[PDB]
Amino acid sequence: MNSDQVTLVGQVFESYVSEYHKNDILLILKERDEDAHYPVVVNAMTLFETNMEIGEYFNMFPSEVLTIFDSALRRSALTILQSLSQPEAVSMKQNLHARISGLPVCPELVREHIPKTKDVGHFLSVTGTVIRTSLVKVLEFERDYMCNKCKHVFVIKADFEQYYTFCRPSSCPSLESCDSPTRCRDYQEIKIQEQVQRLIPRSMKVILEDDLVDSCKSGDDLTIYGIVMQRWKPFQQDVRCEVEIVLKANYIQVNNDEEVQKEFEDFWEYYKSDPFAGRNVILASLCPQVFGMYLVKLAVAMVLAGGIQRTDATGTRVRGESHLLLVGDPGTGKSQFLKYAAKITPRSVLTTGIGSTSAGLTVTEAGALVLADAGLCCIDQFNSLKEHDRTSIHEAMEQQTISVAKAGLVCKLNTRTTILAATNPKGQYDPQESVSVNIALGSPLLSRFDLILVLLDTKNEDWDRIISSFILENKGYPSKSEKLWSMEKMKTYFCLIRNLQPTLSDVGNQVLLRYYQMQRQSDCRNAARTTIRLLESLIRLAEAHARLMFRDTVTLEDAITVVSVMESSMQGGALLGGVNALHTSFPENPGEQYQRQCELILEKLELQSLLSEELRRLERL
């Protein structure tokens, strides 16, 4: 390169670092130790837009720029030390480094796939996970060997391209014709596997150096801004030489459009007079290959909504998710719902159940529950799930954490997953002889499931004809209106409402408390659904219903909806009556039904002081 170019580049970086990076260098100067290591973080877009010439000089030879910036940082530190007013609690350090970040979003610099052979000497950005990890080891850099046959000492260095080997020199750079270890560094070796979510992918062997050692973990998402170079091997006569692709790291990250919003507020601002029309439209687009079955489709959305985790200070943490289980005669559509819900959720694992061994349901290696962190694992054929395995999940289903010390290793892992289940009612189902009798599951397990919906096929002469016409005429989506919704829109909708944190209110909790106190003993209090875990779920479902309607303040409507749904969930013994889930259709007008439901609920449980306020609010809208 030209002599003036590097000088101008160094001037640019030193000016930028002196203008925008005084606090960090001041902090770095005021530290103990003399010569260990100290990095500096510098953004790229700002200095790229400050001068147009630096970018062209940078993104063609990404080797000299780092050294020039290191020299600029050194001279800046020297200048600051010279112009210092408190030279007592300060120390001068000879080891500085550079770390650039904030690369543009150009398609050819944010490539997700590993380059084949075309990117050598190009600055790239890759993302992926971690598989293997080596040990901390120390290299030798430079020797300063004894001077032979001459006087001036030699400062020969090592070469990276030859696996850190040393070549014996014989031609001295001496002016005349006469021609004849307290240094340490750091090292590591890591393997990166490309993610499958955004895609079998191959592996990238990344090499770390200096401070980057002991800064990565197995099983985390990484983003490295490194250079791509080639590593050779010693040559053998009359064979095929071997090469490899590596990635020298220069920076690391531990990371783990207004149009979509504007569309969402347009949608939930148009539906202002009628708030339940939006909810009806949301529920209709779920699994639109099935006719009817309002309650189950609402329950699936409520379960998939989620909740918030609330951990106490010292040791304890409570559950913040929900679980669902369905029972019914074969041929009702249980598998369709699981298949459809296995796709909307970003991360989901589909398993057979009885065909899955103990290596998946628990830890062995990662199984199924641990592998589905922050996701949803679907469970099928729960009738005979290998009773040992069927009972060895009580710990991880309620405490969200496994605690195993098999073979004297003492390993602890985290698992937070919503479980969906569907099993056949072995034996001819009866209206009486509650689920604990027909399916014969233990009471401790038949308490952690929030909603248990029962499906029964009975004698009717209308639903059969409607479903026969639906199947035969091939009338996909009988509502020919072009509202629908695409699957990507639903995925974005359910991936965006997970960020809101609703807060409880006073017109709310009183209703749930009175309902729980009333239900704790009416005349039979069932046998297993009247424990303390009932109220712990009545809040998690009422809160989840509030995150599907774009708000963060629970009101009377959410409480009424959740109470009605959960009361309908409890088959047989109840306080209003049981309604079959399958024989339910979308109401033509939801406002009148909501008003009737509120008037029916708020009379026998004495909260009449709220009914007047609610009717006044409903009238004035």
Binding site: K116, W232, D238, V239, R240, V243, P288, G331, G355, D380
Partner: protein, 475 residues
């Protein structure tokens, strides 16, 4: 073997052993002695050599030093592929696997193939070294394609279509040794062709399988072990497996039997005797896919099968005065998946036994049940199985049948009187699966005659056959 050395030829096969990538160098540069003028010797096929002479202007050569950093060095990709050659012909009884030859992709290729294809490869044939004058054979690829019937095959299939009674000729030629059992052979013929696949609502699809499943149950000695051998023989891809030498690890993926029977039939014998693998194929046959058997850690593979099973009652001979449920040892889950479960009986008649004895000694020297029976005094010469094999392949990839408005009414009416009648009586519960099965079987009787319609007679012919495991039999 020997002669085809350095001669351009062409091949055809599949891919099973796609490997990783690793670069290689072909024109890496060398250092120069004395003066400058470096050079870029064309090193051949990745074998290190030395420039014993250098052209240069003048003087001596040598200059034996490597300079593997200059931009003069050029690199390119590499790959390795193994090809297994198809069944083709020469059906020798020996269990010798077909020979395999390796392939090498040079540049701008790679990631153009996936495990399992049908590819045509043309390239030069060279000889490797150091697998010591002991070498092997491998081919350097030059062009790759991706994805055929002869003219005579077409002429034959049009003449076969030209027959006046195509259904009789194909139902009475599957197995001519066995006498009688018209309806079971008709059901097997219907199963061989198959139905259509529905991709409705492309954005989410959730596809539904389009093939039937038939189980045969009856007394021993009726001959229900050769109607299946012939059916397995006449198929583009088939496999026959017993019910005692296989386990859960055998039928499913560990490449199981179901995977090998993709787009074909995987008929299983001695079905009743299984007692531990019953709950291992419900997911596979219904989900139309199978996942990994190691803790269920994704890695799913397609498995399209048309499983055909034959079994005997639990107590040997089946007595006539009991209930049907206890004589099969099957739950309500696995008994409803199958479309047709034929029940056969052995009764001591007079005329039928006489005719059967006459046939079995001579070999060693209107409802849809009589129009198919052969009245003696005519020639019903069967089509060779070799020609019938080439017919199914043409049928299954050039015609996609669909239902018509007229035919759907009959199926709907049948379903309506079936449900309202059997919802009170005691029998297997009738779900919505039977409505889909009737559609699938009506679609099935449209690929045998090479048509794309649904006539009223088409739907009427799937009513009489259905009344052989349903109501027409439970009594």
């Amino acid at each position: 073997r020997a002669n085809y050395y350095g001669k351009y030829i062409a091949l055809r096969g599949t891919v099973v052993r796609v490997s990783n990538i690793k670069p290689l160098c072909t024109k890496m540069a060398f250092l120069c002695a004395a003066c400058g003028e470096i050079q870029s010797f064309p090193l051949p096929d990745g074998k290190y050599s030395l420039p014993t002479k250098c052209p240069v202007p003048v003087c001596r050569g040598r200059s034996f030093t490597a300079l593997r950093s200059s931009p003069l060095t050029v690199t390119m990709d590499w790959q390795s592929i193994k090809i297994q050659e198809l069944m083709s012909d020469d059906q020798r009884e020996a269990g010798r696997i077909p020979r395999t030859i390796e392939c090498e992709l040079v540049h701008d290729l790679v990631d153009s193939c996936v495990p399992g294809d049908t590819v045509t490869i043309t390239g030069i044939v060279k000889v490797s070294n150091a697998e010591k004058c002991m070498f092997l054979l491998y081919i350097e690829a030059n062009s790759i394609s991706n994805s055929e019937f002869s003219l005579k095959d077409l002429y034959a299939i049009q003449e076969i279509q030209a027959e006046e009674n195509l259904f009789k000729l194909i139902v009475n030629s599957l197995c001519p040794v066995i006498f009688g059992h018209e309806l079971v052979k008709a059901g097997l013929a219907l199963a061989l062709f198959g139905g259509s696949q529905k991709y409705a609502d492309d954005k989410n699809r959730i596809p539904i399988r389009g093939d039937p499943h038939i189980l045969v149950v009856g007394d021993p000695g009726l001959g229900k072990s050769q109607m299946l051998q012939a059916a397995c023989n006449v198929a583009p891809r088939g496999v026959y497996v017993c019910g005692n030498t296989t386990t859960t690890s055998g039928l499913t993926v560990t490449a199981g039997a179901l995977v090998l029977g993709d787009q074909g039939i995987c008929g299983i014998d001695q079905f009743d005797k299984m007692g531990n693998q019953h709950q291992a194929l419900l997911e596979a046959m219904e989900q139309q896919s199978i996942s990994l058997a190691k803790a269920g850690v994704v890695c799913s593979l397609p498995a399209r099968t048309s499983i055909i099973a034959a079994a005997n009652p639990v107590g040997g001979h089946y007595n006539k005065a009991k209930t049907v449920s206890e004589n099969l040892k099957m739950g309500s889950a696995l008994l409803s998946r199958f479309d047709l479960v034929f029940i056969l009986l052995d009764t001591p008649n007079e005329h039928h036994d006489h005719l059967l004895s006459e046939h079995v000694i001579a070999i060693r020297a209107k409802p849809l049940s009589e129009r198919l029976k052969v009245v003696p005094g005519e020639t019903i010469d069967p089509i060779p199985h070799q020609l019938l094999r080439k017919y199914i392949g043409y049928a299954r990839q050039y015609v996609y049948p669909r239902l018509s408005t007229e035919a759907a009414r009959v199926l709907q009416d049948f379903y309506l009187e079936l449900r309202k009648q059997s919802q009170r009586l005691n029998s297997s519960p009738i779900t919505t699966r039977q409505l889909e099965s009737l559609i699938r079987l009506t679609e099935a009787r449209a690929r045998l005659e090479l048509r794309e319609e649904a006539t009223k007679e088409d739907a009427e012919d799937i009513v009489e056959i259905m009344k052989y495991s349903m109501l027409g039999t439970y009594s």
